[PDB]
Ligand binder design. Structure first.
Ligand SMILES: CCCCCCCCCCCCO[C@@H]1O[C@H](CO)[C@@H](O[C@H]2O[C@H](CO)[C@@H](O)[C@H](O)[C@H]2O)[C@H](O)[C@H]1O
Ligand SMILES: CCCCCCCCCCCCO[C@@H]1O[C@H](CO)[C@@H](O[C@H]2O[C@H](CO)[C@@H](O)[C@H](O)[C@H]2O)[C@H](O)[C@H]1O
Ligand SMILES: CCCCCCCCCCCCO[C@@H]1O[C@H](CO)[C@@H](O[C@H]2O[C@H](CO)[C@@H](O)[C@H](O)[C@H]2O)[C@H](O)[C@H]1O
Ligand SMILES: CCCCCCCCCCCCO[C@@H]1O[C@H](CO)[C@@H](O[C@H]2O[C@H](CO)[C@@H](O)[C@H](O)[C@H]2O)[C@H](O)[C@H]1O
Ligand SMILES: CCCCCCCCCCCCO[C@@H]1O[C@H](CO)[C@@H](O[C@H]2O[C@H](CO)[C@@H](O)[C@H](O)[C@H]2O)[C@H](O)[C@H]1O
Ligand SMILES: CCCCCCCCCCCCO[C@@H]1O[C@H](CO)[C@@H](O[C@H]2O[C@H](CO)[C@@H](O)[C@H](O)[C@H]2O)[C@H](O)[C@H]1O
Ligand SMILES: CCCCCCCCCCCCO[C@@H]1O[C@H](CO)[C@@H](O[C@H]2O[C@H](CO)[C@@H](O)[C@H](O)[C@H]2O)[C@H](O)[C@H]1O
Ligand SMILES: CCCCCCCCCCCCO[C@@H]1O[C@H](CO)[C@@H](O[C@H]2O[C@H](CO)[C@@H](O)[C@H](O)[C@H]2O)[C@H](O)[C@H]1O
Ligand SMILES: CCCCCCCCCCCCO[C@@H]1O[C@H](CO)[C@@H](O[C@H]2O[C@H](CO)[C@@H](O)[C@H](O)[C@H]2O)[C@H](O)[C@H]1O
Ligand SMILES: Cc1cc2nc3c(=O)[nH]c(=O)nc-3n(C[C@H](O)[C@H](O)[C@H](O)COP(=O)(O)O)c2cc1C
Ligand SMILES: Cc1cc2nc3c(=O)[nH]c(=O)nc-3n(C[C@H](O)[C@H](O)[C@H](O)CO)c2cc1C
Ligand code: SF4
Ligand code: SF4
Ligand code: SF4
Ligand code: SF4
Ligand code: FES
Lengths: 213, 189, 71, 349, 476, 197, 113
């Protein structure tokens, strides 16, 4: 079933939680849940489009120059994405800054483009890209939410100004009247949260295996 | 002066602890010291060459022709090509040398640092000398951090870490504490 | 340089002795000292073999041979 | 199961070492507590008790024997963090510091002997980064039973809850004062002529941390520790010599901008870090050349970030950096074997 | 010369003053002796007698099968009753091949082959005379003395060092053997100096034995090149590698013998045994052991025949005055826990300490705190903590890099460990695993070579026979 | 085919040509919108210190460039209602604690300050972040002051003997901000006519 | 246009260079990976009739002996490969695990800390 890849990529093979890939945007743009959600959505789009293009162009890539070809097929797309979200989502583009342009070197993008998109049809590749993007977005949202709660208490702040007023329903407040711990926003707070998330993933995997047994 | 610039790049503005660039190979290979040293040397050379080539391409081709938005593409493409040559040229010329630089070279074809550094340098308007120095300093910072982290993880491998934290998670926690330690150099240069 | 083996199932003995080239099985066994290890060895009665072939006491032996005394 | 030798021992124990370190710290801690009054006592007790409780909880979680609580490795960390803190600090500062040290810095790595970083200094850096306002408010010396220091319940309101310290009870220390007045285009000489006395700063009659103030009782305790063979003189001697030499050279070059020697030594937690904190065995080199390199690096970093840095004192940062550098020092400066050269090849005779 | 200073070492409680007062005692002949056939290093000797034979005191019961071995002589006249399994002085408690001799009680000497003017024959003759005497180096290493002397002859020896610096706690056998028999030890040193053409002998005693020093200086004062030296009172000082550094000042190269620096080391009991063998022809039959500990009524030194059960030694010294928490065969720093009291006394037995509860320290292992007190105490200049870390993780190859090869298991590690860690136990386990791997590899190589040779010879024989048969039928 | 090197070169050239064509089409589509967004961002930043009613012409169209003796070269943006200057907006920089602070001033035509906002700073968060208008009203103190009703003795922090409050545990940053404001007012006073009106 | 031609020239130059270099001279996760009881024979005293089949089928020189009623016996060279098990018509080979002896004794690892 084609839907198997989309479900399996979420937790069994997570880009930033199992394969140890896409760590730069995972740690950098994650001081707020909104930043994580925006970066995840952009990466998911880019992944879907690049997977579709590579799979449609699968039987033409010379084996020895496969990288600079496919990299180009990525790079231009990424460029367009930049020139899109700098023009009609400028508020979010100012926040992400460099890491929206740094999707070409995203290890998850090239890894999925090379490993899966060169030996699968267009539909399975599109579904795999969608699944990887969804897992990446979920991880980014979780990390950003934890860091934002520890730093300011609020969850999903200024979503209306970044993602449009339609998402104004997402601005929720946890721990009202909280100055927050400043270290969570700072770089030292990202590695610790990621390590704790990995430890929690290992613990819940062991417990789920025990329950299944 | 340039010594202060290089020291600021290495310590004050470290490409990993305060830049979050090139973290996947950094976290994947730092379990052993010797591959860490090899990758450090390889990535320093690659970043220097990529910075020089990117500056030449930007200031001699892109800007005079008027196309600047293309730069990203062009940049990475050139870098990719260079890396491939620097692999194959060192896989027949000196087979002995294909054990310290050639083996780890494919790991840094797309690293986010070999591309993050030129894009950052463009915004500062560096000249050719400053661009090459910026690339070399970023490579040196990456190398030093990777070597220290490799030593720490090699010692932790023989320690009694809890079974729910042994491996990658303890490495991430250690990297966070190391960034906290490096945070004291802020504002020095 | 040869070896002498006693195939006694109770106690399998194996010794290594250097003998002059062109020696005989009799002198090789006498030099190897297996007689003093086990006084119940009859060199005229029990079978003496080389690598599983019954041989003669004064038959010449080459280097790397294995004299064996058994039933 | 057979038992293996040797069947003799010198009656050593980690409990004795940690308790002797605490005993060496005792006089300076008493001097600090008497000088600052009841709020210092409240903060110190809270920090130590919270450290012990959190250590017990972490031991319970990991299943380690509870007897590990009796070796004093947690009480010592709590003691050092408490004497490193500002005197009239709120309780949650000490509790959070204890939680961040005993916990992430020590117990998350397995326990005593496994962590790669100094727990107390890790907590100190984390507290300074996270809460800069509470960690940069220094209370003037209000000696216990002096008719001007707050009473018992007033001190309770000062430490627990959030009663403001009023006015005239907080002043600037020495290093921060020098840096600020330098930013006020005043040369380094006029600032020290009318704003610093070496005799009183050496005794400990100046604002500062809880136990850092006195650079004399700390020296006595460190010397006693050296004589008891608990620590090695290499690290303290190297740190102090490096700081003094660099400061003296800077003073001799440009006397109107740099202050060095006695001023650098008798200010900040330099002596406390040199004797009691940089000499942590678990996070220091095991060689002699390694310890010398560790001390020299600590001193150089301390002086550099003191003078040209953005901090008034960087003992914690220097200690953390050298703790990071320690494993390479251990693996590249091993002692020479018996019957072998430095490279490890067998000797030839 | 002048004493140098060794690196590392500890000062454990000597406990030598409660036993080095009474003279060397004697033992009534026990009913039966158990003589293991392997009381030495290297190959095991092969028995020459059968069950029921009558032997005399000094008969050669077992003979060496190869060059590196030592014979076993009958301690007393009697009848052989078993050539089978006997209990062994080992911590494991397993049995070993050995003879059981029923002591007749007559105690009649065999017709010994005495020499004539030992300072007249070439060194090889004296070396083989020592070889046919059972001298095994009563120092702990139980390495045959004949092989050591023969290896010494080939090189150039500039000094014969007599290892009289008894350093183990509770042990005083060397002290009494030097107080009472200084003349014999000096004569043996002169005989060894004749065997190995050397310059001088430098008999060394620790400074906590003033009586031994005075007796030795009184005995050796007319012979010239003989010297008496007073080495410091340090624990790992009796070791050959450390004593050589203390005396000469050089260091024995790693993976090399003491003849490289031109020094030969012999124990103070081995020298006396060599003197006895050369002057009178008496083989190695009895030695001197020390019975001490808080659980023995009267600590003493006993002249014990080889193969005597331990229970007889304990009964001789009054008896167990209480409950012995531990029984050790040797010093507390290198001893082995005896399984039972029926264990015999091999040539390498040095003491039988009966330690009570208040002499044994209590230990509660705790994680290593990296205090580096091990590095300051290791005589070989190693890093014990790293070796323990690698041995606990079963990384023997990495452990050997940090000095597991050069470790001598002296015990100075665990003696100064704040968090009580069985460092020597870890090192012994790691060395055992390495030796097991090495033995397995050696067996694999040997069996593969044997298969190759057997297949090749069988194939060539078959081919030659086939060719001969083909030649025969052609002429038919 | 993947054979002769001609295929590799032709494939890479075709990929580059197609990508370049797409990128140039996208750029010609969106560069005007990007420039409009940047201009709107600049106007939004300006509008926080300059109320709409005061100015009629476009402030970001008649930018001056005045050279003084201390600040160097400035970027005075005028706000003329009907051929008459009513407000001048410029920027000041001065060394703080963590580095230079860049701020904006909106002095009216008579010397009254209409509002000051801090653009770029690297002060310690949680200790000297109150200079921002989104967290504290301290930066809103300067709103009616001038060189007339405030002599050259109250233009300092209270630590130095002035009238402006200092942050609890942070005085260097308020010193720098007040010095920048005073220097801007004195610079306006020096250059008459064009800037003064 | 003047830019597409330049980009195409750079692309064809890179392609030709890579092709010529390949003539003359995956995944990140996989690339990281690249960078980073015995038994012995046994012969009783009755089941061997000297049929010399065990020696006949034994690549190792373990069984020693020939002829009849000689009671051929093994050595230390055995590896339990079983080439003599089926060889014996009377089923004399009795492969057994190796027993523990004093010379094959090793110290046990300490329990824990
Ligand atoms: C060994 C360590 C033991 C720790 C023991 C902790 C005991 C005290 C509990 C923590 C403090 C609870 O006291 C807290 O007071 C504040 C105001 O003062 C109020 O709480 C309010 O502010 C706090 C500030 O973080 C937030 O929870 C929130 O914004 C709001 O609830 C409540 O009254 C109570 O949540
Ligand atoms: C919202 C909470 C999120 C938590 C995120 C951080 C992850 C923490 C979970 C893993 C922590 C490891 O810490 C601790 O590890 C030990 C390993 O000895 C586990 O195991 C421990 O408890 C279990 C019972 O559950 C015992 O059977 C076991 O003998 C004991 O070791 C614990 O269950 C875990 O609590
Ligand atoms: C062992 C339990 C845990 C110890 C650690 C936690 C201790 C925390 C102390 C809580 C203090 C609460 O804060 C403090 O409360 C006390 C009562 O106790 C108030 O004290 C009040 O009652 C006392 C009598 O009891 C009066 O003399 C006093 O004038 C009045 O103010 C203080 O004005 C207030 O500052
Ligand atoms: C390991 C040691 C742990 C140290 C724990 C210290 C806890 C200290 C808590 C003190 C109380 C919290 O702070 C206080 O909260 C309450 C409101 O909730 C109010 O305080 C009031 O109620 C509290 C109980 O709730 C009373 O104990 C107190 O005497 C009274 O004044 C004050 O507004 C605020 O000062
Ligand atoms: C970063 C490493 C260390 C991590 C430490 C763990 C977190 C510890 C708590 C940090 C909370 C910071 O937020 C802090 O919350 C405390 C409550 O605790 C508030 O404290 C408030 O309530 C407490 C009682 O609960 C009163 O005693 C106090 O006077 C009042 O201000 C502080 O005004 C606020 O600054
Ligand atoms: C067991 C170890 C020894 C235990 C010692 C216990 C007693 C120690 C008491 C020392 C504290 C009181 O000693 C001193 O008191 C005075 C008040 O008169 C404080 O303050 C005063 O003296 C200082 C000294 O320059 C001046 O700034 C000024 O005159 C005033 O502030 C001092 O800062 C403090 O150093
Ligand atoms: C390497 C290990 C440590 C060595 C010791 C370190 C001591 C501290 C560093 C001393 C650095 C002094 O730093 C340097 O001082 C000189 C003084 O000549 C200053 O120099 C200034 O004053 C001198 C006169 O004194 C003028 O001639 C010169 O034109 C002017 O620039 C430099 O601007 C400054 O860069
Ligand atoms: C600590 C162990 C290592 C010892 C190493 C010693 C090496 C250097 C020895 C020569 C030191 C010369 O030290 C010199 O002493 C003078 C006073 O004499 C000190 O100077 C002191 O007094 C002057 C005014 O007189 C003050 O402005 C100054 O702040 C103060 O430090 C300086 O520190 C240094 O200029
Ligand atoms: C591993 C050993 C490293 C040894 C390092 C020795 C070099 C460091 C000392 C020489 C540099 C001194 O650096 C000098 O000091 C100040 C802070 O005081 C630095 O920093 C200054 O500028 C920067 C950038 O604007 C901002 O952080 C701020 O304005 C200020 O801190 C300056 O860039 C330089 O003027
Ligand atoms: C740890 C250790 C302890 C030793 N203790 C002694 C000792 O107490 N007495 C002694 O004579 N030799 C001692 N030696 C040295 C050997 O036991 C032996 O004397 C030397 O290697 C050769 O002497 P031999 O040939 O006379 O046995 C010790 C060696 C080591 C390694
Ligand atoms: C001499 C000495 C110095 C110590 N210094 C520190 C220190 O600075 N910080 C700390 O948390 N523990 C310190 N300890 C306690 C012990 O080293 C600490 O528990 C280990 O770091 C735990 O891993 C010290 C102990 C000794 C004996
Ligand atoms: S003596 Fe014990 S605690 Fe000290 S370093 Fe050695 S093993 Fe560690
Ligand atoms: S047992 Fe080995 S490592 Fe330990 S002190 Fe003795 S020689 Fe050194
Ligand atoms: S095969 Fe069996 S019967 Fe034949 S010789 Fe061998 S053991 Fe004896
Ligand atoms: S099992 Fe194999 S090696 Fe062992 S005796 Fe039989 S045939 Fe020989
Ligand atoms: S290194 Fe940056 S995404 Fe992998």
């Amino acid at each position: 079933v084609p839907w198997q890849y989309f479900t399996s990529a979420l937790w069994q093979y997570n880009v930033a939680l199992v394969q140890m890939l896409a760590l730069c945007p995972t740690l950098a743009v994650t001081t707020t849940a909104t930043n994580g959600l925006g970066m995840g959505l952009a990466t998911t789009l880019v992944l879907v489009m690049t997977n579709a293009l590579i799979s449609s162009m699968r039987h033409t890539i010379s084996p020895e120059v496969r990288n600079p070809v496919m990299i180009g097929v990525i790079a231009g797309v990424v460029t367009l994405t930049d020139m899109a979200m700098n023009a009609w989502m400028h508020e979010l583009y100012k926040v992400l800054g460099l890491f929206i342009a740094l999707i070409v070197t995203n290890c998850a993008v090239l890894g999925r483009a090379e490993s899966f998109c060169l030996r699968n049809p267009v539909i399975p590749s599109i579904l795999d890209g969608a699944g990887m993007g969804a897992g990446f977005t979920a991880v980014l949202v979780v990390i950003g939410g934890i860091r934002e709660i520890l730093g300011s208490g609020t969850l999903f702040s200024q979503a209306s100004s970044l993602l449009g007023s339609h998402f104004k329903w997402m601005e929720i407040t946890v721990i009202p009247d909280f100055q927050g711990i400043l270290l969570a926003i700072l770089p030292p707070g990202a590695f610790i949260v990621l390590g704790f998330l990995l430890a929690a993933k290992r613990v819940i995997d062991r417990k789920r295996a025990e329950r299944r047994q | 002066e340039y010594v202060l610039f290089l020291l600021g790049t290495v310590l004050v503005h470290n490409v990993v602890l305060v830049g979050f660039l090139g973290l996947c190979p950094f976290m994947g290979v730092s379990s052993k010291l010797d591959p860490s040293i090899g990758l450090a040397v390889a990535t320093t050379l690659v970043m220097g060459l990529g910075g020089a080539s990117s500056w030449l391409l930007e200031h001699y081709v892109l800007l005079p022709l008027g196309i600047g938005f293309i730069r990203i593409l062009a940049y990475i493409v050139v870098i990719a090509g260079m890396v491939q040559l620097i692999e194959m040229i060192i896989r027949k010329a000196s087979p002995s040398l294909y054990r310290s630089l050639g083996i780890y070279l494919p790991l840094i074809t797309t690293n986010c640092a070999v591309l993050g550094v030129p894009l950052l340098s463009v915004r500062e308007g560096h000249d050719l000398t400053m661009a090459v120095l910026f690339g070399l300093g970023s490579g040196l910072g990456f190398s030093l951090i990777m070597i220290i982290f490799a030593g720490l993880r090699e010692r932790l491998a023989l320690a009694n870490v809890p079974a729910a934290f042994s491996g990658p998670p303890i490495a991430f926690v250690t990297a966070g504490l190391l960034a906290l330690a490096f945070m004291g150099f802020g504002g020095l240069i | 340089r040869v070896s002498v083996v006693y195939a006694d199932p109770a106690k399998p003995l194996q010794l290594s002795c250097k003998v002059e080239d062109g020696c005989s099985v009799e002198q090789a066994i006498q030099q190897s000292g297996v007689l003093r290890c086990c006084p119940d060895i009859d060199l005229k009665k029990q079978k003496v073999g080389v690598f599983g072939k019954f041989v003669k006491l004064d038959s010449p032996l080459k280097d790397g041979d294995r004299i064996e005394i058994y039933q | 199961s057979v038992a293996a030798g040797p069947f003799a021992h010198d009656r050593s124990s980690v409990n004795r070492i940690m308790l002797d370190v605490c005993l060496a710290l005792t006089p300076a801690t008493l001097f600090g507590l008497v000088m600052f009054g009841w709020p210092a006592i409240n903060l110190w007790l809270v920090t130590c008790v919270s450290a012990l409780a959190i250590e017990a909880a972490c031991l319970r979680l990991l299943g380690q024997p509870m007897r590990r609580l009796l070796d004093g490795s947690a009480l010592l960390t709590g003691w050092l963090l408490a004497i490193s803190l500002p005197p009239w600090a709120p309780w949650w500062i000490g509790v959070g510091g204890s939680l961040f040290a005993i916990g992430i810095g020590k117990q998350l790595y397995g326990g005593i002997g496994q962590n790669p970083f100094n727990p107390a200094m890790l907590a100190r850096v984390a507290l300074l980064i996270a809460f800069p306002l509470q960690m940069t408010t220094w209370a003037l010396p209000h000696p216990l039973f002096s008719s001007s220091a707050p009473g018992f319940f007033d001190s309770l309101a000062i430490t627990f809850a959030g009663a403001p310290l009023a006015d005239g009870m907080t002043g600037a220390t020495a290093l921060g004062n020098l840096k600020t007045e330098l930013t006020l285009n005043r040369t380094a000489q006029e600032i020290l002529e009318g704003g610093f006395s070496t005799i009183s700063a050496l005794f400990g009659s100046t604002p500062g941390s809880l136990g850092e103030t006195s650079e004399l009782l700390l020296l006595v305790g460190g010397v006693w520790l050296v004589l008891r063979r608990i620590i090695h003189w290499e690290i303290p001697v190297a740190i102090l010599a490096s700081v003094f030499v660099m400061a003296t050279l800077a003073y001799l070059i440009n006397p109107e901008r740099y202050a060095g020697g006695l001023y650098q030594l008798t200010s900040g937690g330099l002596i406390l870090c040199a004797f009691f904190i940089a000499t942590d065995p678990v996070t220091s080199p095991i060689s002699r050349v390694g310890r010398l390199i560790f001390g020299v690096g600590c001193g150089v970093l301390i002086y550099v970030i003191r003078t040209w840095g953005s901090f008034p004192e960087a003992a914690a940062f220097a200690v953390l950096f050298m703790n990071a550098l320690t494993p390479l020092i251990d693996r590249y400066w091993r002692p020479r074997a018996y019957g072998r050269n430095v490279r490890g090849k067998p000797l030839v005779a | 010369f002048n004493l140098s200073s060794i690196r590392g070492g500890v000062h454990p409680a000597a406990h030598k003053d409660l036993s080095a007062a009474l003279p060397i005692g004697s033992l009534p002949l026990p009913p039966r002796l158990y003589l293991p056939l392997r009381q030495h290093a290297g190959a095991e000797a092969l028995p020459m007698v059968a069950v029921g034979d009558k032997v005399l005191k000094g008969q050669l019961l077992a003979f060496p099968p190869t060059e590196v071995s030592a014979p076993v002589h009958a301690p007393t006249s009697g009848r052989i009753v078993a050539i089978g399994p006997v209990p062994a002085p080992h911590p494991s408690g397993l049995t070993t091949t050995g003879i059981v001799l029923e002591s007749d009680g007559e105690d009649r000497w065999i017709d010994l082959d005495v020499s004539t003017d030992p300072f007249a024959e070439d060194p090889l003759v004296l070396a083989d005379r020592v070889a046919k005497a059972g001298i095994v180096g009563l120092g702990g290493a139980i390495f045959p003395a004949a092989v050591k002397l023969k290896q010494g002859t080939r090189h150039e020896i500039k000094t014969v060092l007599v290892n009289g610096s008894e350093c183990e706690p509770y042990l005083t056998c060397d002290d009494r053997i030097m107080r009472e028999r200084a003349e014999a030890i000096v004569d043996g040193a002169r005989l060894i100096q004749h065997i190995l053409r050397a310059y001088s002998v430098v008999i060394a005693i620790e400074d906590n034995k003033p009586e031994a020093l005075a007796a030795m200086r009184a005995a050796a004062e007319h012979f010239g090149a003989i010297e008496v030296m007073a080495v410091p009172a340090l624990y790992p000082m009796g070791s050959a590698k450390q004593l050589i550094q203390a005396v000469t000042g050089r260091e024995v190269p790693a993976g090399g013998r003491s003849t490289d620096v031109g020094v030969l080391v012999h124990n103070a009991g081995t020298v006396y045994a060599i003197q006895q063998a050369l002057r009178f022809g008496r083989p190695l039959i009895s030695r001197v052991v020390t019975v001490s500990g808080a659980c023995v009524k009267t600590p003493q030194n006993l002249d014990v025949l080889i193969g005597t059960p331990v229970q007889a030694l304990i009964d001789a010294c009054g008896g167990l005055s209480g409950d012995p928490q531990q029984l050790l065969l040797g010093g507390p720093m290198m001893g082995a826990v005896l399984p039972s009291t029926e264990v015999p006394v091999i040539k390498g037995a040095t003491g039988l300490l009966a330690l009570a509860r208040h002499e044994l320290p209590n230990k509660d292992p705790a994680p290593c705190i990296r205090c580096a007190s091990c590095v300051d105490a290791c005589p070989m200049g190693l890093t014990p903590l790293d070796m323990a870390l690698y041995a606990r993780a079963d990384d023997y190859d990495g452990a050997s890099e940090y000095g597991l090869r050069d470790c001598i298991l002296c015990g100075c590690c665990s003696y100064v460990c704040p968090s009580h860690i069985p460092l020597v136990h870890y090192f012994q386990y790691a060395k055992g695993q390495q030796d097991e791997r090495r033995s397995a590899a050696r067996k694999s190589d040997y069996i593969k070579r044997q298969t190759e040779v057997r297949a090749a010879r069988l194939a060539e024989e078959e081919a030659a026979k086939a060719a001969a048969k083909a030649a025969k039928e052609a002429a038919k | 085919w993947r054979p002769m090197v001609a295929y590799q070169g032709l494939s890479l050239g075709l990929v580059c040509a197609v990508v370049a064509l797409l990128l140039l089409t996208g750029n010609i589509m969106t560069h005007g919108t990007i420039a409009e967004q940047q201009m709107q961002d600049r106007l939004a930043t300006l509008r926080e210190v300059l109320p709409q009613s005061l100015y009629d012409n476009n402030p970001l169209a008649d930018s001056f460039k005045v050279q003084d003796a201390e600040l160097g070269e400035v970027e005075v943006l005028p706000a003329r209602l009907q051929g008459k200057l009513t407000a001048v907006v410029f920027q000041g920089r001065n060394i703080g604690y963590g580095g230079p602070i860049e701020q904006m001033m909106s002095v009216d035509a008579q010397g009254k300050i209409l509002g000051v906002r801090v653009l770029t700073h690297k002060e310690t968060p949680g200790l000297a972040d109150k200079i921002e208008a989104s967290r504290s009203d301290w930066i809103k103190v300067f709103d009616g002051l001038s060189l007339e009703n405030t002599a050259l003795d109250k233009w300092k922090v209270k630590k130095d003997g002035g009238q402006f409050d200092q942050f609890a545990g942070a005085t260097i940053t308020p010193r720098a901000v007040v010095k920048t404001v005073l220097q801007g007012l004195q610079f306006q006073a020096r250059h008459a006519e064009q800037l003064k009106a | 246009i003047e830019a597409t031609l330049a980009l195409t020239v750079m692309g064809v130059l890179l392609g030709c260079g890579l092709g010529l270099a390949a003539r003359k001279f995956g995944g990140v996760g996989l690339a990281e990976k690249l960078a980073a009881a015995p038994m012995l024979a046994r012969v009783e005293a009755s089941q061997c009739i000297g049929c010399t089949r065990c020696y006949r089928a034994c690549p190792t020189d373990a069984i020693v002996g020939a002829s009849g009623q000689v009671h051929v016996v093994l050595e230390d060279a055995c590896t339990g490969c079983g080439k003599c098990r089926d060889a014996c018509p009377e089923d004399c080979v009795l492969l057994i695990p190796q027993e523990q002896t004093l010379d094959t004794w090793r110290w046990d690892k300490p329990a824990a800390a």
